[PDB]
Design a protein around this ligand. Structure first.
Ligand SMILES: Nc1ncnc2c1ncn2[C@@H]1O[C@H](COP(=O)(O)OP(=O)(O)O)[C@@H](O)[C@H]1O
Length: 252
């Protein structure tokens, strides 16, 4: 049972804003003092909203991985709250931007590798994420990121054209996420209209090698962007390859 007694939660400052309401950090005192994130819901006084909001908790409950944000529990009476593990440093994109000149390449590669472990886990669970992007990743510490929870510019051609979503289309999106990370949180296809993306991809064009990105790593990104989904690596292979790239970079 994930129902948490409200008296065990101390609501702290706002740390972000989601689909349903502000998100706060806070403290959960249980059998103590545990930093947590508290997701609120402006309109959960209505059951139709409440049901959708709490669906997030039901989804996250299914997963247990060190690189996926964990559900701690919920409070289902107004005001409805979802209590999640706190990823204290917040959204990855802003994190990468503020630390553009301070995060070493080994750390950026580490973040990609950690994400691939989470994604290989999801693929093994036969779960298709559909929205892999740096905006959906949270930063727990300088050495730990976790997956949170149309984005045409992140989407695989088969997803844009035919609404096909599989672990392979996730791999494509992850390729764009890795590019984002190595670009310090710049979004892909800046200045390009969404409707023009597919045209460039079909032309064979791809996001360019980020400055200072190891060629072996950029090569991995391009493999994620094979047009034919069957030719892309599986996540477990990206995990394996990212491990070696990370180790090589740690070696300097
Ligand atoms: N577990 C968390 N730890 C730290 N910050 C979080 C956490 N959950 C959400 N946030 C902050 O709240 C924002 C919105 O939450 P998010 O989960 O993305 O909303 P949604 O309900 O739309 O999925 C995030 O982008 C981040 O800034």
């Amino acid at each position: 049972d994930y129902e948490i007694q409200r008296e065990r939660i101390e609501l702290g400052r706002c740390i972000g804003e989601g689909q349903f309401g502000d998100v706060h950090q806070g403290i959960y005192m249980s059998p103590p003092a545990l930093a947590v994130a508290i997701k609120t819901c402006k309109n959960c006084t209505s059951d139709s909203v409440r049901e959708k909001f709490l669906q997030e908790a039901l989804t996250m409950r299914q997963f247990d991985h060190p690189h996926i944000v964990k559900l701690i529990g919920v409070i289902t009476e107004n005001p409805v709250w979802i209590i999640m593990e706190l990823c204290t440093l917040g959204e990855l994109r802003s994190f990468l931007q503020v630390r553009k000149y301070s995060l070493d390449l080994a750390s950026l590669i580490l973040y990609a590798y950690q994400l691939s472990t989470a994604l290989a886990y999801l693929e093994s669970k036969r779960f298709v994420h559909r929205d892999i992007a740096a905006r959906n990743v949270l930063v727990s510490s300088n050495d730990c990121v976790k997956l949170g929870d149309l984005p045409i510019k992140w989407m695989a051609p088969e997803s844009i054209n035919f609404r096909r979503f599989t672990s392979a289309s996730d791999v494509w999106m992850f390729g764009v996420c890795m590019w984002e990370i190595l670009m310090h949180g710049v979004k892909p296809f800046q200045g390009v209209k969404n409707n023009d993306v597919i045209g460039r991809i079909e032309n064979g064009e791809r996001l360019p090698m980020p400055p200072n990105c190891p060629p072996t790593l950029y090569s991995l990104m391009t493999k994620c962007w094979a047009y034919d989904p069957s030719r892309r690596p599986r996540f477990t292979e990206l995990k394996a390859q990212l491990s070696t790239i990370l180790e090589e970079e740690k070696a300097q």
